[PDB]
Amino acid sequence: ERTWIFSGAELKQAIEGKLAPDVSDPEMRRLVSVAKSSAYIAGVADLTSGSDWCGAGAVAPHELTDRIYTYLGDMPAEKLDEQAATLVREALKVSFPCEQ
Amino acid sequence: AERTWIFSGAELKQAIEGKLAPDVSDPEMRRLVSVAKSSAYIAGVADLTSGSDWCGAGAVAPHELTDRIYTYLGDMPAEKLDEQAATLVREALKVSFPCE
């Protein structure tokens, strides 16, 4: 019943530099791994900007990764097995809420 | 600047083509990092919208998503490709793999 490309656990591993399994090079596993996490987060952040979270023009990419990493660190194993993107949306919404 | 998005459509199209990692000097590594970014950006959008904007995640291979998105971005004029990539990914997925 898993159909998602990244789980929360895998996105957390990507941020930590651990999600380039098909890369044999060392000390360039890290570059590919964090490129995946940054780009996955960017997909969710770009799509949801101005709807689920606000202030895209005043937030640096590194700040998005930091908030998401903190949030994923808060999640128990059952939530981290679910799709990563919903967790990114939740992190952005609590971090950078839109005025209701 | 009016632009707040991390990837434009033009940048996602360049990433799929292996040309969005300018601070990576080894050519093969530039290509690997670039396509890692495109795959992960698309995955963020695809995972978030699965079962709502597009359907079939269990049966469609990741490479098929990239192929449909690349075709779709190739359909867009330059002004539209300057907009956020994620909404273009959602549009590509919705026309390619519609729900109900």
Author numbering:
A (entry chain A): 2 to 101
B (entry chain B): 1 to 100
Paste lines from the article.
The crystal structure of AtTai4 was determined at 1.55 Å resolution. The α2 helix (residues 52–74) contributes to dimer formation in the asymmetric unit, which is consistent with the size-exclusion chromatography results indicating that AtTai4 exists as a dimer in solution. Superimposition of AtTai4 alone and AtTai4 bound to AtTae4 resulted in a root-mean-square deviation (r.m.s.d.) value of 0.8 Å, indicating that no structural changes occur upon complex formation. AtTai4 shares 32.3% amino-acid sequence identity with SmTai4.
